[PDB]
């Protein structure tokens, strides 16, 4: 029904995502099918490791000021091992939790291949032949502790990844230049949409 | 029929919202159920009072450079008195207006309690202030040059004895001169409560 | 089914849009009916002409630093000739006619015009050239702003920038937005 229209991490998940070390972050990600598009809400809380309490006064150097979170999917839209996200409670919605057994197909939640193809290569190619690197991307900000003063550059990228031997991918890249002092990585919620693959 | 999926202020409301004084603003808010989430559009036009013509040259102090708008809901998703918004024309859609009499239940439009709870030495147990928030900008007169910091907050409020809450907090640092508070439209989504 | 709920340019279009000269850009626009609202994604790639390789070092003037893209619709939500977008591959998902009032921006919410609202008809945001944080472009989406041809409805994408970009193709990041829909 409306349960099988949503593919999520529970709305209040247990640590389920690797940012620096195993299960160091809670990624809340909801994918809902509104017709041909996926409406998505995402937020990220890191609870231990490198990013659990950002301090770029004591750690300048860019590896403490950016990180990414990859979802990698196979042909059937199943979630692959290289993924930042743990697949245990990443499944179709069931009344505020998930379905019993793991899901066998989720292609209709995948970013559309035509709209977001995995390589783009311009030159030798006519103008009428050219494709869009940028189209594959949403560039926005999230705000740490929900504070306007603490922005984090956020690029969501569709089918950017080749890791494992994935067909589909959603990649959240976070980065900042402010030198934050004892700021937990606790993101504001972020709404976005992409064009869906057909079955 | 398909109109039971939408809960709105109507698309063209009469002044229906307190910002500084009684019915001084028109709040346009549409809530639509897309599956497990609420797709929402909001805009705010203030037509009289403190914010009808911002001038922080003549009033520099902070209280003339920020304000909030609270929607407070009970257990059944009915609107409480503490709310900034008047309940008279806030109801399920009917063909570009609203249904005749008020409805008593709208829980499925409420911000999810699990995702956005009211809230601790332990990191791995702790819950997220920020998750409950969307931080963005609206633009006065729809002008890129006139930004307004906008925080939407789910279940932040305790006023009256509300279970659910949507809070629009506006603030600015630019000292605007004779700029009406006329916001650009703002799309957002939140995860919805389920109705047992 | 949900085919008739989507009105798009197709997800990977052939050049289909005038920015400066005929068919000089690929406009990707998806409109989906989620209840009373339209959920939309838009992105623009210009492939030839004035904006195919922006350089405001060599062309500083205003006309090289902004442009708009107009969709003009009649009473039935059919696409009119004055439009920036070519009508040939602008149709319901899986292909052909438009008769598509339910995808139009609501007249009450967004009229042609105590007080009334300039802003309400507008969404003001940024897109990013090449998907690069460093290359912002001021973007205003406007509903029923246009009078060209004899349109009833209109969607207008206005892009503008002040940064002096050097050999930057106009390749926009995707942009999600919603508006209140007209009833049939």
Residue numbers in the entry:
A (entry chain A): 395 to 593
B (entry chain C): 395 to 513, 518 to 594
C (entry chain B): 395 to 489, 496 to 513, 523 to 593
Published text:
To investigate other closely related HAdV with homologous fiber-knob proteins we performed a BLASTp search using the HAdV-D49K amino acid sequence. This search revealed that the HAdV-D30K protein is highly homologous to HAdV-D49K, differing in just 4 amino acid residues ([Fig fig4]). Residue 338 is not surface exposed on either fiber knob protein and is likely to be functionally homologous (HAdV-D49 = Isoleucine338, HAdV-D30 = Valine338). However, the remaining 3 residue differences, E339K, G331A, and Q332K (HAdV-D30K → D49K) are surface exposed at the apex of each fiber knob monomer ([Fig fig4]). We further investigated the effect of the opposing charges at residue substitutions 339 and 332 ([Fig fig4]) by modelling the electrostatic surface potential of the two fiber knob proteins, based on our crystal structures ([Fig fig5]). The surface potential maps reveal that whilst structural homology was high, they present radically different electrostatic surface potential distributions. HAdV-D30K is significantly more acidic (pI = 5.57) than HAdV-D49K (pI = 8.26) ([Fig fig5]). Thus, it seems probable that the interaction requires the basic electrostatic potential. Structurally and biologically we demonstrate that HAdV-D49 knob protein is unable to engage CD46, whilst potential interaction with CAR is extremely limited by extension of the DG loop.
Here, we investigated HAdV-D49, which previously has been studied for vaccine and vascular gene transfer applications. Here, we structurally and functionally investigate the tropism of HAdV-D49, focussing on the fiber knob protein as the major mediator of cellular attachment, and evaluate the potential utility of a pseudotyped HAdV-C5/D49K vector to infect a range of cancer cell lines. We demonstrate HAdV-D49 fiber knob has weak affinity for CAR, although it is not dependent upon this interaction to mediate efficient cell entry, and in fact the presence of CAR may even inhibit cellular transduction.
